[PDB]
mmCIF file of all heavy atoms in Angstrom:
data_model
loop_
_atom_site.group_PDB
_atom_site.id
_atom_site.type_symbol
_atom_site.label_atom_id
_atom_site.label_comp_id
_atom_site.label_asym_id
_atom_site.label_seq_id
_atom_site.Cartn_x
_atom_site.Cartn_y
_atom_site.Cartn_z
ATOM 1 N N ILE A 129 -4.799 4.576 -5.043
ATOM 2 C CA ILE A 129 -3.995 5.774 -4.729
ATOM 3 C C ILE A 129 -3.227 5.486 -3.451
ATOM 4 O O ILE A 129 -3.830 5.227 -2.383
ATOM 5 C CB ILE A 129 -4.877 7.008 -4.559
ATOM 6 C CG1 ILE A 129 -5.615 7.342 -5.863
ATOM 7 C CG2 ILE A 129 -4.000 8.202 -4.124
ATOM 8 C CD1 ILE A 129 -6.505 8.564 -5.766
ATOM 9 N N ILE A 130 -1.917 5.481 -3.591
ATOM 10 C CA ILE A 130 -0.999 5.048 -2.491
ATOM 11 C C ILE A 130 0.031 6.155 -2.257
ATOM 12 O O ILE A 130 0.700 6.597 -3.191
ATOM 13 C CB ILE A 130 -0.330 3.707 -2.812
ATOM 14 C CG1 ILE A 130 -1.358 2.588 -2.800
ATOM 15 C CG2 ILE A 130 0.803 3.395 -1.849
ATOM 16 C CD1 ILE A 130 -1.040 1.451 -3.707
ATOM 17 N N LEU A 131 0.163 6.564 -1.008
ATOM 18 C CA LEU A 131 1.138 7.584 -0.591
ATOM 19 C C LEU A 131 2.320 6.949 0.130
ATOM 20 O O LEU A 131 2.128 6.143 1.070
ATOM 21 C CB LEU A 131 0.483 8.612 0.316
ATOM 22 C CG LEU A 131 1.384 9.721 0.861
ATOM 23 C CD1 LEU A 131 1.906 10.562 -0.261
ATOM 24 C CD2 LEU A 131 0.626 10.584 1.882
ATOM 25 N N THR A 132 3.537 7.308 -0.311
ATOM 26 C CA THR A 132 4.761 6.827 0.298
ATOM 27 C C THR A 132 5.608 7.990 0.785
ATOM 28 O O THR A 132 5.339 9.149 0.409
ATOM 29 C CB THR A 132 5.598 5.953 -0.686
ATOM 30 O OG1 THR A 132 6.074 6.782 -1.766
ATOM 31 C CG2 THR A 132 4.784 4.799 -1.260
ATOM 32 N N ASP A 133 6.557 7.702 1.650
ATOM 33 C CA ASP A 133 7.385 8.732 2.285
ATOM 34 C C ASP A 133 8.698 9.049 1.503
ATOM 35 O O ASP A 133 9.516 9.786 2.039
ATOM 36 C CB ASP A 133 7.704 8.337 3.704
ATOM 37 C CG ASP A 133 8.071 6.894 3.858
ATOM 38 O OD1 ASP A 133 8.433 6.240 2.837
ATOM 39 O OD2 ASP A 133 8.054 6.383 5.003
ATOM 40 N N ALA A 134 8.878 8.428 0.353
ATOM 41 C CA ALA A 134 9.943 8.730 -0.629
ATOM 42 C C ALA A 134 11.371 8.586 -0.145
ATOM 43 O O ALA A 134 12.302 9.077 -0.787
ATOM 44 C CB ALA A 134 9.726 10.162 -1.143
ATOM 45 N N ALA A 135 11.563 7.916 0.982
ATOM 46 C CA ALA A 135 12.902 7.671 1.494
ATOM 47 C C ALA A 135 13.123 6.154 1.747
ATOM 48 O O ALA A 135 14.148 5.595 1.393
ATOM 49 C CB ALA A 135 13.182 8.445 2.757
ATOM 50 N N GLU A 136 12.091 5.539 2.343
ATOM 51 C CA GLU A 136 12.057 4.111 2.552
ATOM 52 C C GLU A 136 11.059 3.381 1.640
ATOM 53 O O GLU A 136 11.169 2.191 1.394
ATOM 54 C CB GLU A 136 11.817 3.839 4.040
ATOM 55 C CG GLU A 136 11.554 2.406 4.495
ATOM 56 C CD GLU A 136 11.870 2.202 5.965
ATOM 57 O OE1 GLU A 136 11.049 2.559 6.827
ATOM 58 O OE2 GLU A 136 12.954 1.646 6.261
ATOM 59 N N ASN A 137 10.113 4.202 1.084
ATOM 60 C CA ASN A 137 9.080 3.740 0.162
ATOM 61 C C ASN A 137 8.180 2.680 0.801
ATOM 62 O O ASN A 137 7.796 1.689 0.182
ATOM 63 C CB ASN A 137 9.636 3.256 -1.167
ATOM 64 C CG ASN A 137 9.947 4.382 -2.131
ATOM 65 O OD1 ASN A 137 9.881 5.566 -1.749
ATOM 66 N ND2 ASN A 137 10.285 4.039 -3.360
ATOM 67 N N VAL A 138 7.834 2.874 2.095
ATOM 68 C CA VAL A 138 6.792 2.072 2.700
ATOM 69 C C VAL A 138 5.452 2.812 2.547
ATOM 70 O O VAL A 138 5.396 4.044 2.472
ATOM 71 C CB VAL A 138 7.111 1.818 4.179
ATOM 72 C CG1 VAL A 138 8.214 0.784 4.301
ATOM 73 C CG2 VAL A 138 7.455 3.104 4.910
ATOM 74 N N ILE A 139 4.349 2.033 2.493
ATOM 75 C CA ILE A 139 3.030 2.600 2.271
ATOM 76 C C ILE A 139 2.548 3.232 3.544
ATOM 77 O O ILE A 139 2.332 2.570 4.567
ATOM 78 C CB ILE A 139 2.039 1.502 1.783
ATOM 79 C CG1 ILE A 139 2.532 0.933 0.444
ATOM 80 C CG2 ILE A 139 0.641 2.077 1.706
ATOM 81 C CD1 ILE A 139 1.640 -0.225 -0.060
ATOM 82 N N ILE A 140 2.382 4.580 3.517
ATOM 83 C CA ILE A 140 1.806 5.272 4.667
ATOM 84 C C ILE A 140 0.337 4.933 4.792
ATOM 85 O O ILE A 140 -0.172 4.584 5.847
ATOM 86 C CB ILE A 140 2.044 6.770 4.563
ATOM 87 C CG1 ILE A 140 3.536 7.083 4.628
ATOM 88 C CG2 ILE A 140 1.296 7.526 5.653
ATOM 89 C CD1 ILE A 140 3.899 8.411 3.964
ATOM 90 N N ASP A 141 -0.415 5.041 3.659
ATOM 91 C CA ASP A 141 -1.805 4.689 3.602
ATOM 92 C C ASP A 141 -2.169 4.395 2.129
ATOM 93 O O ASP A 141 -1.460 4.801 1.209
ATOM 94 C CB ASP A 141 -2.683 5.808 4.140
ATOM 95 C CG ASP A 141 -4.044 5.329 4.630
ATOM 96 O OD1 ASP A 141 -4.318 4.101 4.479
ATOM 97 O OD2 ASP A 141 -4.836 6.123 5.136
ATOM 98 N N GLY A 142 -3.313 3.707 1.978
ATOM 99 C CA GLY A 142 -3.813 3.470 0.652
ATOM 100 C C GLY A 142 -5.308 3.775 0.563
ATOM 101 O O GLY A 142 -5.989 3.702 1.588
ATOM 102 N N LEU A 143 -5.740 4.145 -0.588
ATOM 103 C CA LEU A 143 -7.190 4.426 -0.792
ATOM 104 C C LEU A 143 -8.034 3.150 -0.652
ATOM 105 O O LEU A 143 -9.089 3.180 -0.062
ATOM 106 C CB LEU A 143 -7.395 5.075 -2.164
ATOM 107 C CG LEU A 143 -8.858 5.384 -2.585
ATOM 108 C CD1 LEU A 143 -9.513 6.223 -1.542
ATOM 109 C CD2 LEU A 143 -8.896 6.085 -3.913
ATOM 110 N N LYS A 144 -7.530 2.064 -1.207
ATOM 111 C CA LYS A 144 -8.142 0.747 -1.030
ATOM 112 C C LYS A 144 -7.171 -0.156 -0.292
ATOM 113 O O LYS A 144 -6.048 -0.381 -0.755
ATOM 114 C CB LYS A 144 -8.525 0.120 -2.373
ATOM 115 C CG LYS A 144 -9.446 0.995 -3.216
ATOM 116 C CD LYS A 144 -9.758 0.375 -4.559
ATOM 117 C CE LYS A 144 -10.511 1.310 -5.452
ATOM 118 N NZ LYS A 144 -10.606 0.772 -6.846
ATOM 119 N N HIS A 145 -7.592 -0.675 0.844
ATOM 120 C CA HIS A 145 -6.755 -1.546 1.685
ATOM 121 C C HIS A 145 -6.888 -2.978 1.234
ATOM 122 O O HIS A 145 -8.023 -3.490 1.128
ATOM 123 C CB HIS A 145 -7.145 -1.378 3.174
ATOM 124 C CG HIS A 145 -6.818 0.004 3.709
ATOM 125 N ND1 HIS A 145 -7.513 0.541 4.785
ATOM 126 C CD2 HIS A 145 -5.858 0.902 3.383
ATOM 127 C CE1 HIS A 145 -7.021 1.747 5.022
ATOM 128 N NE2 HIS A 145 -6.012 1.974 4.214
ATOM 129 N N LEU A 146 -5.779 -3.635 0.981
ATOM 130 C CA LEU A 146 -5.782 -5.011 0.500
ATOM 131 C C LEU A 146 -5.066 -5.890 1.468
ATOM 132 O O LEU A 146 -4.138 -5.437 2.204
ATOM 133 C CB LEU A 146 -5.107 -5.116 -0.887
ATOM 134 C CG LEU A 146 -5.921 -4.814 -2.184
ATOM 135 C CD1 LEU A 146 -7.057 -5.815 -2.324
ATOM 136 C CD2 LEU A 146 -6.433 -3.394 -2.279
ATOM 137 N N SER A 147 -5.454 -7.162 1.514
ATOM 138 C CA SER A 147 -4.948 -8.134 2.520
ATOM 139 C C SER A 147 -3.785 -8.912 1.956
ATOM 140 O O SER A 147 -3.523 -8.876 0.733
ATOM 141 C CB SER A 147 -6.071 -9.039 2.933
ATOM 142 O OG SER A 147 -6.188 -10.125 2.016
ATOM 143 N N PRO A 148 -3.030 -9.635 2.771
ATOM 144 C CA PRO A 148 -2.052 -10.600 2.222
ATOM 145 C C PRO A 148 -2.671 -11.773 1.474
ATOM 146 O O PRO A 148 -2.017 -12.454 0.708
ATOM 147 C CB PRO A 148 -1.257 -11.048 3.442
ATOM 148 C CG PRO A 148 -1.312 -9.893 4.362
ATOM 149 C CD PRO A 148 -2.688 -9.311 4.193
ATOM 150 N N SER A 149 -3.978 -12.063 1.742
ATOM 151 C CA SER A 149 -4.643 -13.187 1.097
ATOM 152 C C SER A 149 -5.365 -12.718 -0.178
ATOM 153 O O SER A 149 -5.062 -13.214 -1.250
ATOM 154 C CB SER A 149 -5.637 -13.830 2.044
ATOM 155 O OG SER A 149 -6.180 -15.026 1.479
ATOM 156 N N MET A 150 -6.294 -11.775 -0.019
ATOM 157 C CA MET A 150 -6.957 -11.177 -1.204
ATOM 158 C C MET A 150 -5.996 -10.227 -1.873
ATOM 159 O O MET A 150 -5.574 -9.251 -1.272
ATOM 160 C CB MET A 150 -8.236 -10.467 -0.753
ATOM 161 C CG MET A 150 -9.335 -11.292 -0.029
ATOM 162 S SD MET A 150 -10.405 -12.434 -0.967
ATOM 163 C CE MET A 150 -9.366 -13.884 -1.236
ATOM 164 N N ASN A 151 -5.724 -10.482 -3.161
ATOM 165 C CA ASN A 151 -4.685 -9.774 -3.946
ATOM 166 C C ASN A 151 -3.346 -9.889 -3.268
ATOM 167 O O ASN A 151 -2.823 -8.891 -2.720
ATOM 168 C CB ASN A 151 -5.057 -8.310 -4.244
ATOM 169 C CG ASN A 151 -4.236 -7.711 -5.351
ATOM 170 O OD1 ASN A 151 -3.378 -8.360 -5.954
ATOM 171 N ND2 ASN A 151 -4.440 -6.425 -5.631
ATOM 172 N N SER A 152 -2.795 -11.111 -3.230
ATOM 173 C CA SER A 152 -1.603 -11.437 -2.448
ATOM 174 C C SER A 152 -0.387 -10.634 -2.892
ATOM 175 O O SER A 152 0.387 -10.134 -2.102
ATOM 176 C CB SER A 152 -1.338 -12.931 -2.553
ATOM 177 O OG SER A 152 -1.160 -13.344 -3.919
ATOM 178 N N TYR A 153 -0.213 -10.495 -4.217
ATOM 179 C CA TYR A 153 0.859 -9.616 -4.717
ATOM 180 C C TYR A 153 0.443 -8.157 -4.541
ATOM 181 O O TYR A 153 -0.745 -7.842 -4.668
ATOM 182 C CB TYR A 153 1.139 -9.919 -6.186
ATOM 183 C CG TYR A 153 2.243 -9.058 -6.754
ATOM 184 C CD1 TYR A 153 3.587 -9.339 -6.443
ATOM 185 C CD2 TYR A 153 2.009 -7.988 -7.599
ATOM 186 C CE1 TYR A 153 4.625 -8.588 -6.964
ATOM 187 C CE2 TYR A 153 2.988 -7.203 -8.111
ATOM 188 C CZ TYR A 153 4.334 -7.517 -7.788
ATOM 189 O OH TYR A 153 5.354 -6.726 -8.295
#
């Protein structure tokens, strides 16, 4: 579950936080 600000579409927060290494995409 990911919430965005609908103008720039950057992730404000996520229910599960993922790293650039683990689940790189």
Side-chain angles (χ1 to χ4, degrees):
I129 298 180
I130 291 150
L131 177 64
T132 66
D133 43 18
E136 172 156 80
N137 279 7
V138 287
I139 297 175
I140 296 157
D141 203 358
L143 178 55
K144 305 177 188 171
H145 293 152
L146 277 296
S147 85
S149 187
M150 301 285 78
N151 196 3
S152 59
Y153 182 76

